[PDB]
């Protein structure tokens, strides 16, 4: 199969006698296919930056193995030559420490896997606006990607209500470097939605949040590009194209429903 860098796919496997799914000694979790009881699903994501050229996954069964080849596609993201190259920044030492501390926190949060659906059917858009700057716009040096937009931006006047794109559990709700005021929601199955640059946070860590429920107010009045909501999705351990992920997720789960029981 084929996958564009920085996107996720939902891999389908036979359920009977399946034991584990691996990528070079990394284990990939599985979950039920909601519409075919004989199938299970797994989420595989390619990183946007410096991805492998090909990927071989092995599904181990009780008495056989199945190989799955994924070729990485470059896609057709918007890209611009970064003319300095130098791209090494020197934050003051106090900023460096805060960035490192928030990175260790985020890394641990994203690897704490929830093995059940916290979501409620389809994802909805977190506000009924439009994209102003989409995922994956890249800045290249000679021709390796130096940086890229790791989420998608919606137009929003400062103070616009922002709603949970799906049900789940709030894992982050605080001011972080780069992301500003941010909310991160665990939806289960290693899927997290991200809401950055907020002007107001209206939830607490560990709160159960319903789809369409208010999580804060849009902000970023003073950003490099002015007020907007930055929306992100992390799935399969990587930032992925969020609208492309939502489209793929909804095709599978949109006829399902769940209200929190725990
Ligand atoms: Zn953004």
Author numbering: 20 to 281
Quote the original article.
We have described herein the reactions and the structure of Pgp3, a Csd protein of C. jejuni. This enzyme turns over the cell-wall peptidoglycan by both the d,d-endopeptidase and d,d-carboxypeptidase activities, as documented by mass spectrometric characterization of the requisite reactions with synthetic cell-wall fragments. The Pgp3 monomer is structurally divided into four regions: the N-terminal domain (NTD, residues 21–95), a flexible linker (residues 96–147), the LytM domain (residues 148–259), and the C-terminal helix (residues 260–273). The Pgp3 LytM domain contains a highly conserved tetrahedral Zn2+-ion-binding motif (H168xxxD172 and HxH249).
The structures are: (i) tartrate-bound wild type (WT) (open form), (ii) citrate-bound WT (two structures, closed form), (iii) H216A mutant (open form), (iv) H216A mutant with tartrate (closed form), (v) H247A mutant (open form), (vi) H247A mutant with pentapeptide 1, Ac-l-Ala1-γ-d-Glu2-mDAP3-d-Ala4-d-Ala5 (open form), and (vii) H247A mutant with crosslinked muramyl tetra-tri peptide 2, NAM-l-Ala1-γ-d-Glu2-mDAP3-d-Ala4-mDAP3-γ-d-Glu2-Ala1-NAM (open form). The amino acids His216 and His247 are strictly conserved for Wat-1 and Wat-2 coordination in the M23 metallopeptidase family, and for the core of the catalytic machinery. We decided to mutate His216 and His247 individually to alanine in order to abrogate the binding of tartrate or citrate at the active site and impair catalysis too. In the case of the H216A variant, tartrate was sometimes observed in the closed form crystal structure; hence, only the H247A variant was pursued further. Since crystals of Pgp3 contained one or three subunits in the asymmetric unit of WT and variants (H216A and H247A, both discussed later) depending on the space group, we analyzed the oligomeric states of the WT and variant Pgp3 in solution using size-exclusion chromatography with multi-angle light scattering (SEC-MALS) experiments. The molecular masses of the WT, H216A, and H247A variants were 28.4, 28.9, and 30.0 kDa, respectively, close to the theoretical molecular mass of the Pgp3 monomer (29.4 kDa). These results indicate that the likely functional state of Pgp3, as measured herein in solution, is monomeric.
